[model samples]
Target: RRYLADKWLYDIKHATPDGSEQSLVDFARNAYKTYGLHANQQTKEIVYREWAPNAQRAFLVGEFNNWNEESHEMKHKDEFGVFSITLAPLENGDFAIPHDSKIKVMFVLPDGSKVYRIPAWITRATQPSKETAQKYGPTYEGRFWNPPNSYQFKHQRPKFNLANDSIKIYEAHIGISSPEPKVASYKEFTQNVLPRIKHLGYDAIQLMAIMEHAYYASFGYQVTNFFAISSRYGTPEDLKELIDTAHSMGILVLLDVIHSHASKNSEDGLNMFDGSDHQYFHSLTSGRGEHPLWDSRLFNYGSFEVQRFLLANLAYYIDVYQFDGFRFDGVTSMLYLHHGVSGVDHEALAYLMLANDLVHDLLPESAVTIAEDVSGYPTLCLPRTAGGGGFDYRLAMALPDMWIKLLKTKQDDDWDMGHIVHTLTNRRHGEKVVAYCESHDQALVGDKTLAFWLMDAAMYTDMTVLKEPTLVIDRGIALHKMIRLITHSLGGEAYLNFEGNEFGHPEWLDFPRVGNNDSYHYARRQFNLVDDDLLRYRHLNEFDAAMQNCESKHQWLNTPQAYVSLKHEVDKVIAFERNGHLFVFNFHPTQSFTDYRIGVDVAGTYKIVLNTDRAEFGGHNRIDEAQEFFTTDLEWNNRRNFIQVYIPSRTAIVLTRQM
Candidate 1:
């Protein structure tokens, strides 16, 4: 039966196109063309235009004009509410046009004098410094950065083909990638992280928090400067070099783009670019326009000027940074005025009651955008032409969150197999989902990582392979391997894991902040955990390596059409077959069922391809490596094949039927 819009009222509608989708795309394209939003430099002294519909008078104030608020005034046009000005000449440098050029907006008084404000497109603005402001006079100078004439791109971007092929993504942060406690550079991450990703055989890398944020503790979400690369991780050239390096390595890079909300710093951000609080954001007087959860200002998509500024920002990153795509962050927050912190209230439900109401809500899809929403919004991953949310992918955030929650709150015997299968296949047809067991977002401070939750405080003392593992350590290692295997096998069309998470990186991520007395001890990863052969971490790493190789050869994960033959919740065991590959998982704590008969789809010889309870993966080495099982005619569910095999406790097995 076809799912129609409003037939069930909550189901995703098929066979209709949304009107707002076209309007949003048109708005974005116009903004890009209006701003001359090409990566290449413009030589001619062209007239610059800005839409400040509410501004009484706009002025072109920058370094070239000695930061003069009155000089270089722009002439206002009546119909479009646009102001225009021309420049005499400018040498290559960063520059900004400050609104209220007389006083810093943060310190603006209740009755502050009227002055011209800066445009949102300005590259550089005055930093609050006593020395630089004094030497440069009242307003800081804005430098015009002209790209070198003959910059050549040595590498070509990969061809864009939406293959039904499943994607395996490596989610990473550029900084803090190195083993050292000190801040890591882009060059270092490209060198260090790229090799590991290549070795792990991930198709893409989803880079987290690349935008420039003044606060390191913010983890790149609170962007102070959107256009500029963070100086903490090296220069802009360094980031460009890293992207080039990844492209050469045959890995696509997906940036974690944060356009839903912005940092509230007026001097460093676009918050008060026109000397007005409502210039680029929803007015604070509006029903909680601010995102209290993230402590940032929310965008007012209703405003035409804000739409232009944000759309232009989207074009800037794609054109200038050479990013392959973006996983748009905090999308649920953007969908509602309440920032998705609370459950969908009456206001939010009323705001987007219709299926096509939010079709024009997102930025244009020149590059890919993924939504991180927990509201189970139908067709969130569908295309704009289908009367759906225009996200190329919607993260399976519920899968990871639910997995961690279950592992923490429930016992092994209490694990529900039915819920696991439902969650894995809980997706709208014709939509793509990126499934992961866990990500960096889950490993932040004040939260227990997947590893920490399973092993608990015992991870510190009982992790050595040489020492006999306690019950807790053994269970954690076995379950970790099984969890990843199950999730990878049946979760979605794609899979992802945070950096160092495959090997179960111990300890929670806590950056050097005042709350922890500025401790960098736990902020960085300890590569030695997996590097040491004597430790059990090596086994986890080896299992991960084998899992990737197994998936690469079979390519079964690319297909999502899998059927479950058995799901015994009472036994904590589940068996399923997908794309000619059979999977058997036993999550029982201490029960090892021998000669456990399970039905198979194909009546052929099945090989013991990969097993989690092997010696290499810190298991008891219970099952034989060369053991193979043949199907018999004693079928239990009207199928011709019934296979009998040993099922180990707290372990999983994947069997490939040999043709």
Candidate 2:
């Protein structure tokens, strides 16, 4: 595999440029600066460049020239099929396309037929209104972005040193970031949600639906414009401002990129932009390039030009928006034929490796990239030096499924501690993983969040503190904290939580669509619940922040994997030690244990660090936080030390010894 990686890197270097690896990253980062609308600082000429090899002729059209297709003819440049045009400043030397006006690229095909589409490297795209969209179908116009105020980054990318090296990512979407039932702006996310995320003690954020997607319901998975930010949120400047603000708070921002496939939109998307189906994607004649289930155009990743485009798209984010990293979408349905070697596409996987190499080579060690691989791609997290995908991290998608399976099928008494422990402990020894209790898919309309699963209808009715607690509410609250605490402490090297999952958001997430009568009833995350002092949702929020605070103070994510010493099935208890901190969980519905014997590798005085059963976290205060314990030098569970402590039913706790 190292030989394979070396071979691929060698081929890539030779294929594009002579053999300088630096040129690959340099070219990718320069694409956004070259293509699309740019200005000649010295000559004062507006330059517009596009690649449409199959088109016989090209023109720049829009209200700037009153939509006349033949007025501004572009000059064709060489065999690469790049078209260029220079716009002289207006009569008084005032404007280039008059700031924020609509524009389009008109291309005459090899057949002498004309077609219009958005520029591949467009900076902004505006969608039609609801009334106009319904009558004329969904369409967009590329906007020539000329902002009055250009944002300047003030702070540097945060450190990932020995202390605070691990990540606790708060995954969220801007459109649904607010409590209001509408698309939230980037400015709002900066002003409103950035504070909330910082307060939650999350060091990083993975934002969903930032790319330009025509269909909002697809949730940014179907990317229409790779280079443009979603205008539905705000202008490109607004997004840059948001990123800068997050960096100011010492938080990293990552984009959820959809390079695996693309939206099959023609008018303002990357379909037939060159007047040939095979230009950017596989030929429709050879076989349908559309995904069978996703209904999107599949990228022809082997093409040198397409490879540049994809790499260029990735670099565009890192350079233009200063995004710290990327979370690639839809790797399960992607080009890697992981299950069988029946001869499918892996050039796409090759492009994926190429992007990873380009990103790492271009940025500092602070930059990170992750793959959403559900197939357990063994070598993905291995270094490109070892002929692997060179991803910094790979998602632990199974943990979510295992937790969901237990909740859906098993009772408290029937829950198998050994099986749960095995799932948590099992992983590729050298690779890093982000452990989570649930997926973002569960937050969507069809399924449920972990909190929703436990309480079901109880959360809707019994959330108020004034109301007497029901059996369902108490159990749900107790388990929610236990599940996340255990998963974070034992599941993997990094931890991730969705936007509203921290507070046990009661309702399901739904975007505004026709099937739901275009209602945004469930689209918004009700932070109001956590804001109210009387609501129990506030307690869960406190616990989530506390978990993060504890981790930052006594970080164990980067340490060796936890050493499990107890998994008592009959008592329904599990315990482990990581970085010398002791953790214990009791899943029994009715039974609490006193003087529970748990083993420890380190012998010292210990005190409770994070008590999930504390009354502030909506627990019974059954385990006192003020109490301390001493570990005895006794042989127990193959460990050198043993400690006896009280454990409450359906609750979990963390204990640590100070130096």
Candidate 3:
């Protein structure tokens, strides 16, 4: 506690002015009230503002003035180097700048050079056609987006408390959500994908790549415009309608916010906006301005102007879009000077705390903030008042890594029960985690999904329901069900799954690129595979829905940690109890125990609630679901009583005590 207090003090002392009493919140709020463009409806005028400290002069160029450079010149307003220009009513009684008109800013740098650049706070940017983009490299024109008919939300936001409720999340990418080869629109995703997610029993959906990026294949990580919605996905009103529809169905939406770094394109991105290298980023002499791996410019988090720009960006999304929360992407890059190699960046830490403070203050109950930090930083999800980063949850990045490693390096019988239990339960105290067996990262081109690794070539040839299953297919199906069931039961307080991974979606995700002849074959989700009655993929999907139903009915994820009753290394069996339910797993490849004994705390009748060996889940009908077992008075495995049942090879089961 003392160490944290000292760290907080160090940040404050460095942030404030010498002999002045300004808090970080005060600095952030003052910056937000002054920056960005504002329009007056009644006055028939629009005031544009930007902080360009090193520019000699700037001009507004767009359709209003026929793209003339000297038509509307801006004047320097303050000693702090802010520029402003007010476009007044024209002589014909029309507004100087009409709504939806394309615009750009021309800047005259100190080196006597001129460049056309998009405004720093542009809310709407449109990309040109393929022919135009080929000729001009990459071009973007900003649009005045204050439409007269704004979307008004009808339903209220769903009541939620991150600390108490257990969230089941479905991670999705909107552009590639459809099965068609073309890019999908927001309306298509809302009409087709949203209902499928609700039927799958997930409570929340985390949308990826929502921010406007120049390249479609970058997966929205190379953000060009922070405020603009991707025009490829349709208009801003379409996205608003999507979120509104989701709220009506009681599903929360989380934006995959990328505030770590930015794209380096000079024409469309925030790179050398005022022809000064250090205006929004670090100086070249600092040796920390650029990311070696991402090829992007890093923000100077210590600058007061930069801090307010980012904070206001967050507020803009919440107030305009009515998003329920944010999933902060690439946070490890933000928290470290060397991109999480070692040590902490104190300035970045201060910025994160301030960001969270503003988010909760703006919307106290419904808004959630999750950090995507792989560094396992201490107290990331704790409250900021406790000298922590103040996130609601951190992604369980290690769990997916461990699963892949085990599947690649070890056989079924060689897996140790103790190691599996320890890895699943490992986490920092007081910090919540969202665990998953696999996510979008695991399904990329270079890597393979868990199903692909398990079934491989068989997924292409032997998935027909009419064909007899081979030994490889049987083993893969059984293990897939067991892996998902165990991870959902004991891994963390919350659970997440990438779209279509529930039904054991086959193959890796390869976006359209030149290396693969720009093919969209692997970019889209093949939901038809799970919908076909003649295919075996539907069986895996059934098990996933059943698993979610069981969790919701019992509220097991919100309960205390599982109590390990037995972990037999040689027998290859594990048993545990959670929320008055008993879970058992037998991982032996070919060994089936006739009467496996599992201990229980309470003496009562127990019935099988879920069985991976049932015929419905693509398993042999080895165990009987109708059978009931009564625990005896005989003590076993440190429990008062025990029940014996037949355990099949590579199978798992859940039993609930009758009330």
Candidate 4:
């Protein structure tokens, strides 16, 4: 660990002036404030700046200048090859470029070919009309976003201290947040989704695909414009309103930032932006600039200019949009030269360290950055001052994978209790983790969610509450609740649930594509399924709500690591204690133990706080919730005291000692 830290510090020292004197945070801060498009509202002047080292000439062409190729020429600033164009008010006091003017940059390449491209720093990019999209196929044009009516935040940002607070994140996508079959707008999400998330007890929302991506099917991973919000959702203010409303409701909004790679679209994206392949990416040396599976261009993390560009984009979002923080996507791809197949790349590690440092420095108490890193990079969530990446949390990426693997390969009775306990408890000591049983990755087209894997076709017809549930549905419901509860209590310091997965939402997430004939059937979520009381989907939804409420009330997420008291493979039972609460699980398919002897540390009367077998949660109520069990002095399972209670198969119960 020290070796890696020493190497990172040494690299940072050399990356800036006066080795060992200037901090990376200072260098990043200076870079962001100095670059990008700057507009002066009082003077009615706007200055466009870009780094196009390979361009012979550049011109600003848009609605203001009648799209003329030769007008509004930009001059190269220095030998470093930065270009700038200042647009001031006319002599008659009319601005050259009015607010909301559509714009684009035309760069004259070394080959003497003029190619129109979206400016890298563009804040808003609008897609053409449907007819134009069908004709030209999803084109984006820049827009001057100096609106006179800027969104005034109605509420102060929620008070959140990342060092002390535990996050309960609701991962959602604005386009799919609505129940409609079509793409949903940011305004709709603000009004509809925000309330639902707040009601569900989530403290933060991790919004996916906010950055401009030409292809919606990529789920916002293949980013085209780093600084622009996706126009497919709504106007920039619409998103601002969404964030503002979220803040007003005491919800922190986290942008799903993708800086690891960029889209391959030459016309709309930054690929060969200045007619050079190595502009913002690495030169194609043995597949250095390409991601093999994603089919996108990898960033050149070693370059000083590229680091500044990425760092500046981060600052741009926080400063302009007032987002609470970021959940960095595809961090594993960025951390390795071989796209995670090989060991960690020193340059990328240094870059992430610097990025986290910048975010925390800029926002201080409110900023919470999470890394979606699967490689288990040592000290990923540690502060930079401690020689670690300054991420607030790391996603427990393997937890979902483990659940999927178990469901696919093993039967319920064959499930190893010891292995389940180990996998859920496994984490780097002192590093915070955002644990979930399933995420968007598990619900993709090829894969299945935990519900789909468990219930299968029974969910299609047997979900009606009028009919008795089949054995399959019963087992599925029971196991789903147990899985989520155990994971929430023992997996990590924070918790997350993907949109609609809390209700066992059926069907895979298949976005509109050529293979599906561009259908939106599977592209949207079905909140109505859970909303209908006649359907059994509401049962899972009810259980999820109760589970979240119980966890929140007890502050279980802020607890220490769970102490495993028992793991009986033969009986298919697992027991653990966390945060003054005892959790017991029975995975057996048919067995129910009456007066089951379990060890306890506290010799007090314990009451059932949460039971998966409750009638409200669609479970056959077997355990008496009204009864409280008292521990005896008899030693059991190497403990000082013992408590005996009824344990039902495929059910989990939580007990809290009376104060």
Q: Which has the greatest TM-score?
A: 2
lDDT string, candidate 3, 408-500, tens digits: 899776888888888988878888888888877777888888888888998889888888988888888888898998899988878899888
lDDT of each: 0.67, 0.80, 0.83, 0.81
Q: Model 4 over residues 529-635: C-alpha lDDT tens digits?
A: 87788888887887877777777677778557877889998998888788778888888888889888888887899988888888888888787889878889988
Please report the TM-score between candidate 2 and the true structure: 0.94
Q: In candidate 2, which residue ranges exceed 4 Å CA deviation? A: 1-22, 161-164, 288-292, 337-344
Off by over 4 Å in 4: 1-34, 131-137, 286-289, 404-413
Model 4: worst 10 consecutive residues (lDDT sum): 1-10
Model 4 has an lDDT value of 0.81
Ranking by TM-score: 2, 3, 4, 1
Across 48-91, the per-residue lDDT of candidate 2 in tens digits comes to: 88877788888888888899887788886766768888888767
State the lDDT of candidate 1 residue by residue for 1-659, as single tens digits: 12332332232222124522234344554565665212323443445666665566655544545756666666665586676666533464322332223322111223554533434454433333678667843333222334444234578766544444556788777667867777887878877767877887877888887776766778778876665555567655667778888878877778777876788766556666666677667677766656646778866554545444655566556556677666767767755545655443322222222212232243222245566776656666665456555556677777777777797678666878888888887777767777788867677887877888888888878887667888788788888888888888887777788878888888778789999888887778877787887778888888887877677788875575677777787788888888888888998887888888888867878887889888878888888858778888776654568888887888788888777
TM-score of model number 3: 0.93
RMSD list, candidates in order: 6.8, 2.7, 3.3, 3.1
Best by lDDT: 3
What TM-score does model 4 achieve against the real structure? 0.92
| Backbone Cα, N, C clashes tallied per candidate | 12, 0, 0, 0
Q: Residue 598 CA error for candidate 4 (Å)?
A: 2.1
